Design a binder for these strands. Structure first.
Ligand SMILES: Nc1ncnc2c1ncn2[C@@H]1O[C@H](COP(=O)(O)OP(=O)(O)OP(=O)(O)O)[C@@H](O)[C@H]1O
Ligand SMILES: Nc1ncnc2c1ncn2[C@@H]1O[C@H](COP(=O)(O)OP(=O)(O)OP(=O)(O)O)[C@@H](O)[C@H]1O
Ligand SMILES: Nc1ncnc2c1ncn2[C@@H]1O[C@H](COP(=O)(O)OP(=O)(O)OP(=O)(O)O)[C@@H](O)[C@H]1O
Ligand SMILES: [Mg+2]
Ligand SMILES: [Mg+2]
Ligand SMILES: [Mg+2]
Lengths: 362, 432, 605, 52, 99
DNA sequence: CATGTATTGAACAGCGACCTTGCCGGTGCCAGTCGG
DNA sequence: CCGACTGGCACCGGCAAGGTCGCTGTTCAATACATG
């Protein structure tokens, strides 16, 4: 008998696949394009940009344009997965502390637009913790659009202790354009920006000692790696390589007043009950695409060890799948026998309304 | 008939205090959003949340609440409550289309119930509903006192609430969910005063102890007890303001409060002849300041707290104008005065239903000592202490009470309607 | 009181048609006899699903892959082998990367072999322990070669020492110098499709000492592991192994246009006792940095038997700095058999120079961290070292020290027994400088913990290796602490003892498996190319286990190949053959990182 | 794994059959305080399911 | 004007007394029990989920046996490859450096 | 041409260990009946 | 609205029981290889 579906509603990239699978079937940009003067989604919308206004329907991890979001799910089911929701239960991920109204509205849409039989909404941080191997820990989830720190104890995510660094993978791309423009290259265009995001994904890393790297970058040849544009001209970038990710650790470097990921991790831990903190320092878990920079774990280990009491073991769990951990945890959850007595049935929706999600999903 | 779904009313419950402010939707076991009441100021620009306090040239740390646990800066109160109830708990408005890099009134849904300190004066209650009705378009409003909600967070209709806050320690008798007005008793001997005690005690050990806050250390290495710390401190392109340093040091005083200090729990006060001499021999508790400065703490661990139980024990204030605590402002004096403000016939019922509340009650041994003190000051009566809360986390007791109150279907008849306010102006006094 | 008076006043209590409460009521889950559908079928595991899709598509194309588009890489502390799977022999380059820097590698550290210059006596100058051990080994050889009834003139060492002391360099230039030899012109631009003036391989060694901009050489691999001793930071090390392999693709294979690389596939050979962090680094280079379509891993001894065509063998790999032993049977390296010793043909060179220096080798100023001295030392090692206890006598020879921008100096010299004692260090490894091999061994890159239980080490462990560690340091602590305590010991043992402790753990107590493996010894790796290494090792094994002396049989290389290339040739066969479904595809790795190595490899990773 | 009886109650009982769920809409509700004054809360509604 | 009435006082008090004694106590019990059950559900679920996430890595006899077979398949094929290059025809790529 | 074999890759059958919830004897706290 | 007394349900540790799962084992047609 046929499997349930798992959809990860990313600010940057949407991911979808069948429960039980260990990786998504479909990964495509969360872009909807409508004519300037039909609509297109994902790579098509980027390709046909010349005749389209493009908008993201998800901003800072949260859905903001429902009429567009419904088109992304339509593309997900009918073009990407090639399966009709009328025969499959669905698990949707959502960002931590998203508004109640958004839980209700996405409940409304996968019943009333897609006639899905039974469905469940799930906190992205928690799922990334399941995929990371454990029941208790603190999840730094850092995506394209937003960065959250979420303490979770005995599989319950503490809402009050969540801290949101409003800065993430797009900001680091805007920033890497900025510092390369200062170096001498031109990258103002959207068809240039989508090159710079690839440059960020390949060449960047996080320094273990930022001041020492700045001091030695003035003389080292090794640092200055080079990258071919589609245009055929070749760029070279140097201290830009680490100054782009370093903004995670020093958001002043790109001009906002929030504390870095390390201080926000520490503050989230410190907002927890004293008895729990031993376990959270022992179980820091990294999630989401922005956490993929080489050596982010080593620097998180260093920085939090500098903030923590010298008695605390500090442990940074960075699984190799951490780019898709949010989806993978969903896969797992939607493929336990237990799921059936945990979802919203259409028979419940039909007499409870969208507000059933506030009972049933917790 | 039977056209409606599974939902009643998505109320949200707001709970301001001197140290912290708490907000979120009714019918959840914890508030969604808890923030430092202390708010950032930089350059005519106000900043909120513990993620947005950091060293910057202009940075100054204000608070919209005074040490009476009442609002003193209603403009900032409006901005803070709008950050909680609007920016963090409602759907975002989408970006304009050009600005996304690809191309090249708010509370009408949710009634607001708000928490007030027991002694909060009518003028401040009037201004609360006035601010609410202008600024967010809210459909209905209600205002209720922390003791009443704290009792509901323990499940008790009638209770003695001991409420050991930050800026204030309070005792009050709750009966059938009303406060018995004569019983309200209040004291500075609370988590803020206790920080001053700890500061004083540090500035008076044989080598003086210097707190240095977490933000000023770049790197630290472990060191043996009482050694000079292997560390390197920061420097900045600007002076750090005194308000900022004071706020960032309070974290360390909170860490010392929670992980070291311990209420004297043995028989009799700490200053009875044998007790101090005994305490000096015991295994203590260890602590680390952010500097790396490591020490084992033996007998002071009790004394810093003991002053709120017997003023005789208290250290002198570091601020010379912060006058010493009177006998009448010690916890047993509060308790005895509070209960003596209540009908003699009701006293056993209250004492059987003791509710403890507030983060300062999370001192090790606080329930022990309070059980002893209640026993010895009211002999021949049963005593049973309860924490406010549904969980180990007894921090949120006032809030959780609101969450529960606004979820009771019987309650929704009580709200001050938008339409009542816009017809009467000061309903808030008499409809209570 | 009052009753209907309340209603007349307009005051009336009211439930508002609401429920008695709105607090969530939650039904408890039941998990009795629970089941899971997660990763239960090949359909669901991405690494297998993609392979089934590739199998189906191959069957369809058959009804109606290219060795020239498979690259085979085999890294090493002195040498990198690289080539296409089509190719008869791999191109070999010194795995060294040269860059502009403030100080050359000779200026940063004490000279090698290490000496206490201006020491109070020559016995202190070379270290007293070491001098006693050299004297032992000289006497041991004299007794041994007298037992074999060779000629020994009593004055042998004196004839060498006095001659080497009294002789002085001749000086030659122009057509009097046999070679008009070049130095790398670091000023000239790279024509191989790139901007940065960096050099690899033989050309990097041939950078003059006083080049106009100063160049420092770096080796990213030493002692058969990542060379964290030298590198300031992790990123700088990764960036150099990336830069070296990048230039090797460009400058040896001639794949100059980078955009074409996405259509190629790659086979990487890794040691039998690998660090997981080194395997996962090499994967990540091959996919995020080079964007190659497929990557596959084969273990050095596994590959060695694929180079021979052996079902079952004991493979002894004697590298420049690593010697490793493991026993192969039924398509796997036997997990517990693996032994990994931190010595090889470089130690023989250092030791060879140090023994001649102590005797009286003319160029006392020599320093193996200086490039032309390094090449000198290595050339002499390859010519004069021999484990054959024969044709050994006072012999006179000469070499040229073609220093950079300085006249060619020719030294006559003599040797007697340093030429055999230095190699024989493989049977008393204390004679080697092992003092700093363990230096910085976890300075940058931590030990490989398990993905989820991050205390627990997840590197390979082998009973045979622990037997070797116990011989150096006799051996409730956590598994982390135990692994740390083991890493603090440098694995060292005589080569015969290492082989027999390998084989005993391969057999797990079965004389018949012992009698097969001991009769099946195959020697590979360049250190093995010291003349008569295989027969000498057969002798040493015979005399430690007389119970096996009729079956013990050692063979050099396989099927006429050079010892160096066998493992490469084998890894090419694993590229070419059709049954191999071991490939990590590029799309797998993008989706699931190193997790897919566990799903795909042909052993328990 | 999947079978009959308990432990698969939901996976047997789910609808799978395309039929429309009842359409919800953001209606309103008249709420009456104990002081008799009436005020409006936004509340979900759907059309009545038919007679047996 | 509005709220000084004895009647108002009675209803206000009666609402609050019933709300405090009956409804707050019912809802307290229900909320505490509901929290305990929610926490239990999530604990139970997280324990299963976290086991599954790791389960693929645990060695099994069947997994071991099939892996040994995959190795042995490849090994026989490798012997076949050499048979097709030494027995089917002697097809060695003899080569020299020609320096 | 085409006799003859142990092993292969797999479907199918068998057994005990395992995790979890039901039913159980018992201690305890509680809502409700009754009198006032 | 209130307390004393009663029958009842919540909770404790404990043993009996369930199916899933992993370990164990027999049997089949098809295979590469050998003598013949
Ligand atoms: N290997 C990588 N190195 C660096 N950055 C990466 C890497 N892979 C992806 N990213 C970046 O991570 C972001 C995408 O991550 P992810 O898909 O988790 O975001 P998302 O979930 O859509 O965002 P959000 O969680 O905010 O909704 C992009 O900015 C992308 O460029
Ligand atoms: N674990 C702890 N142990 C003791 N004191 C603590 C602990 N955690 C926090 N505190 C202190 O108690 C106060 C926390 O705020 P709390 O809710 O208890 O009071 P508040 O409601 O913010 O202020 P108030 O009621 O006085 O207006 C602070 O003074 C804080 O330093
Ligand atoms: N012709 C030769 N004769 C003798 N010895 C040689 C010859 N050529 C090289 N060697 C020696 O053999 C050593 C081993 O070379 P090889 O290329 O196997 O190193 P390697 O495989 O990189 O070692 P490792 O893999 O452990 O780093 C060389 O370092 C050199 O000292
Ligand atoms: Mg995401
Ligand atoms: Mg308070
Ligand atoms: Mg080698």
């Amino acid at each position: 008998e046929v499997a349930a579906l798992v959809i990860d509603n990313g600010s940057g990239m949407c991911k979808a696949g069948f429960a039980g699978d260990d990786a998504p079937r479909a990964v495509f940009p969360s872009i909807v394009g409508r004519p300037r003067h039909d609509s297109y989604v994902g790579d098509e919308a980027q390709s046909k940009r010349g005749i389209l206004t493009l908008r993201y329907p998800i901003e800072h991890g949260v859905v903001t344009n429902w009429d567009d979001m419904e088109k992304i799910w339509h593309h997900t089911f009918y073009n990407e997965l090639r399966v009709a929701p009328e025969e499959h239960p669905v698990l949707l991920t959502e960002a931590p502390i998203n508004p109640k109204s958004n839980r209700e509205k996405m409940t409304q849409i996968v019943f009333e637009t897609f006639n899905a039989p039974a469905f469940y909404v799930s906190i992205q941080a928690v799922l990334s913790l399941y995929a990371s191997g454990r029941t208790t820990g603190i999840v730094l989830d850092s995506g394209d659009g937003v960065t959250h720190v979420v303490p979770i104890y005995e599989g319950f995510s503490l809402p009050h202790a969540i801290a949101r660094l409003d800065m993430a993978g797009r900001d680091l791309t805007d920033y890497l354009m900025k510092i390369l423009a200062e170096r001498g290259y031109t990258f103002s265009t959207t068809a240039e920006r989508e090159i710079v995001r690839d440059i960020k994904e390949k060449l960047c890393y996080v320094a273990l000692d930022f001041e020492q790297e700045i001091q030695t970058a003035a003389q080292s040849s090794h640092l200055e790696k080079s990258y071919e544009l589609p245009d055929g001209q070749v760029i070279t970038i140097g201290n830009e390589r680490f100054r782009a990710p370093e903004a995670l650790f020093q958001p002043s470097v790109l001009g906002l007043e929030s504390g870095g990921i390390h201080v926000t991790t520490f503050n989230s831990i410190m907002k927890c009950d004293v008895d729990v903190r031993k376990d959270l320092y022992g179980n820091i878990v990294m999630s989401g695409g922005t956490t993929m920079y080489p050596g982010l774990s080593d620097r998180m280990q260093k920085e939090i060890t500098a903030l923590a009491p010298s008695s605390m073991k500090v442990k940074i769990i960075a699984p190799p799948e951490r780019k898709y951990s949010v989806w993978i945890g969903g896969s797992i959850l939607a493929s336990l026998s237990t799921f059936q007595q945990m979802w919203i049935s259409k028979q419940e929706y039909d007499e409870s309304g969208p507000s059933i999600v506030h009972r049933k999903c917790f | 008939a039977d056209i409606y779904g599974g939902d009643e009313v998505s109320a949200l419950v707001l709970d301001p205090g001197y140290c912290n402010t708490r907000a979120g939707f009714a019918g959840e076991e914890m508030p969604k959003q808890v923030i430092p009441s202390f708010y950032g100021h930089v350059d005519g620009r106000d900043l909120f949340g513990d993620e947005v306090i950091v060293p910057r040239a202009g940075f100054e740390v204000r608070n919209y609440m005074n040490r009476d646990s009442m609002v003193e800066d209603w403009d900032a109160a409006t901005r803070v409550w709008e950050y909680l109830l609007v920016q963090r708990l409602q759907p975002p408005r989408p970006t304009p289309a050009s600005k996304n890099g690809l191309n090249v009134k708010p509370l009408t849904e949710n009634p607001l119930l708000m928490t007030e300190a027991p002694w909060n004066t009518p003028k401040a209650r009037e201004k609360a509903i006035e601010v609410v009705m202008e600024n967010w378009g809210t459909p209905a409003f209600w205002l209720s006192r922390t003791p009443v909600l704290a009792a509901f967070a323990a499940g008790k209709a009638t209770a003695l609430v001991i409420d050991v806050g930050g800026a204030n320690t309070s005792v009050t008798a709750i009966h059938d969910g009303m406060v018995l007005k004569r019983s309200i008793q209040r004291s500075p001997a609370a988590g803020v005063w206790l920080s001053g005690q700890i500061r004083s005690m540090w500035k008076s050990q044989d080598p003086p102890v210097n707190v240095v806050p977490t933000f000023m250390v770049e790197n630290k290495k472990p060191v043996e007890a009482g050694a000079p710390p292997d560390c390197r401190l920061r420097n900045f392109g600007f002076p750090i303001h005194d308000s900022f340093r004071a706020f960032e040091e309070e974290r360390v005083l909170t860490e010392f409060k929670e992980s070291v200090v311990e209420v004297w729990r043995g028989p009799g006060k700490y200053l009875n002849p044998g007790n101090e001499d005994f305490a000096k021999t015991q295994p203590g508790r260890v602590f680390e300041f952010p500097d790396g400065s490591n020490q084992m703490w033996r007998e002071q661990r009790y004394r810093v707290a003991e002053g709120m139980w017997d003023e005789t024990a208290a250290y002198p204030s570091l601020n010379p104008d912060e006058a010493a605590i009177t006998k009448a402002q010690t916890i047993p004096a509060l308790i005895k005065a509070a209960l003596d403000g209540v009908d003699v016939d009701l006293r056993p019922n209250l004492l059987g239903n003791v509710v403890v509340t507030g983060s300062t009650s999370l001192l090790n041994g606080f329930n022990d000592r309070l059980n002893h003190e209640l026993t010895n000051m009211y002999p021949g009566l049963k005593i049973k202490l309860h924490a406010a809360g549904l969980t180990s986390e007894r921090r949120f007791g006032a809030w959780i009470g609101g969450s529960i109150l606004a979820s009771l279907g019987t309650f929704h008849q009580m709200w001050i309607s938008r339409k009542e306010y816009e017809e009467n102006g000061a309903g808030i006094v008499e409809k209570r | 009181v009052s009753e209907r008076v309340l209603a007349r006043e307009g005051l009336e209590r009211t439930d508002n048609g609401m429920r008695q409460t709105s607090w969530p009521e939650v039904q408890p889950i039941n998990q009795k006899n629970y089941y899971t559908d997660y990763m239960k079928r090949d359909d669901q595991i991405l690494s297998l699903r993609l392979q089934n899709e590739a199998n189906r598509e191959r069957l369809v194309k058959t009804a109606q892959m290219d060795p020239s588009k498979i690259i085979v890489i085999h890294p090493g502390s002195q040498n990198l082998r690289i080539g296409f799977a089509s190719d008869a022999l791999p191109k070999t380059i010194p795995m060294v990367l040269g860059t502009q820097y403030s100080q050359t590698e000779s200026e940063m550290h004490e000279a090698l072999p290490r000496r206490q210059f201006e020491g109070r006596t020559m016995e202190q100058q070379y270290g007293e322990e070491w001098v006693k051990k050299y004297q032992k080994m000289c006497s041991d050889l004299k007794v041994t070669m007298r037992a074999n009834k060779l000629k020994v003139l009593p004055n042998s060492k004196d004839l060498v020492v006095n001659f080497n002391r009294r002789t002085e360099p001749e000086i030659i230039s122009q057509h009097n110098d046999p070679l008009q030899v070049e130095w790398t012109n670091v000023n000239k631009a790279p024509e191989d499709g790139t901007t940065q003036k960096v050099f690899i391989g033989q050309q990097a060694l041939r950078i003059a000492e006083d080049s106009s901009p100063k160049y420092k050489l770096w080796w990213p691999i030493q002692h058969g592991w990542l060379n964290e001793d030298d590198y300031p930071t992790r990123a700088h090390l990764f960036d150099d192994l990336e830069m070296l392999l990048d230039r090797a693709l460009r400058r040896e294979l001639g794949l100059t246009k980078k955009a074409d690389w996405k259509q190629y596939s790659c086979v990487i050979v890794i040691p039998d006792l690998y660090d997981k962090r080194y395997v996962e680094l090499l994967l990540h280079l091959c996919i995020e940095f080079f964007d190659l379509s497929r990557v596959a891993f084969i273990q050095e001894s596994m590959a060695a038997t694929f180079g021979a065509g052996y079902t079952q063998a004991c493979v002894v790999d004697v590298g420049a700095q690593k010697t490793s032993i493991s026993c192969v049977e039924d398509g796997l390296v036997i997990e517990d058999s693996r032994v990994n010793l931190k010595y090889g043909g470089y130690d023989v060179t250092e030791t060879f120079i140090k023994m001649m220096l102590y005797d009286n080798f003319p160029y006392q100023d020599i320093n193996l961290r200086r490039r032309h001295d390094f090449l000198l030392a290595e050339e002499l090692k390859m010519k004069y070292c021999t484990l054959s206890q024969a044709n050994i006598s006072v012999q006179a020879f000469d070499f040229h020290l073609r220093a950079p921008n300085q006249p060619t100096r020719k030294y006559q010299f003599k040797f007697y027994d340093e030429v055999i004692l230095a190699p024989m260090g493989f049977y008393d490894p204390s004679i080697f400088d092992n003092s700093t091999k363990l230096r910085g061994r976890r300075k940058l890159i931590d030990r490989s913990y398990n993905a989820y239980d991050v205390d627990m080490p997840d590197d390979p462990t082998s009973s045979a290796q622990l037997a070797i560690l116990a011989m150096v340091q006799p051996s409730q602590r956590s598994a982390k602490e135990i692994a740390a305590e083991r890493d603090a010991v440098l694995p060292i043992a005589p080569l015969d003892v290492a082989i027999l402790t390998s084989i005993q753990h391969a057999a797990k107590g079965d004389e018949k498996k012992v009698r097969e493996l001991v009769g099946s010894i195959m020697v590979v790796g360049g250190g093995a190319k010291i003349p008569h290494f295989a027969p000498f090792l057969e002798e040493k094994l015979k005399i430690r286990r007389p119970d096996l002396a009729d079956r013990i049989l050692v063979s050099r290389s396989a099927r006429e190949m050079d010892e160096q290339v066998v493992v490469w040739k084998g890894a090419s066969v694993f590229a070419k053959l059709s049954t191999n479904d071991s490939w990590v595809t590029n799309y797998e790795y993008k989706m699931l990182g190193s997790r897919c190595i566990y799903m795909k490899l042909l052993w328990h990773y | 794994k999947a079978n009959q009886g308990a432990i698969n109650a939901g996976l047997r009982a789910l609808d799978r059959s395309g039929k429309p769920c009842r359409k919800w809409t953001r209606g309103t509700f008249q709420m009456k305080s104990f002081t008799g004054v009436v005020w409006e809360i936004p509340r979900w509604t759907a059309p009545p399911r038919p007679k047996p | 004007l509005k709220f000084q009435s004895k009647g108002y006082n009675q209803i206000y008090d009666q609402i609050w007394r019933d709300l405090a004694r009956k409804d707050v106590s019912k809802v307290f019990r229900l909320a505490t029990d509901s929290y305990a059950t929610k926490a239990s559900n999530l604990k139970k679920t997280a324990i299963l989920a976290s086991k599954e996430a790791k389960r693929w890595q645990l060695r099994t006899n069947k997994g071991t046996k099939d892996l040994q077979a995959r190795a042995k398949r490849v090994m026989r094929d490798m012997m076949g490859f050499w048979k097709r290059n030494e027995r089917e025809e002697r097809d060695l790529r003899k080569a020299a450096e020609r320096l």
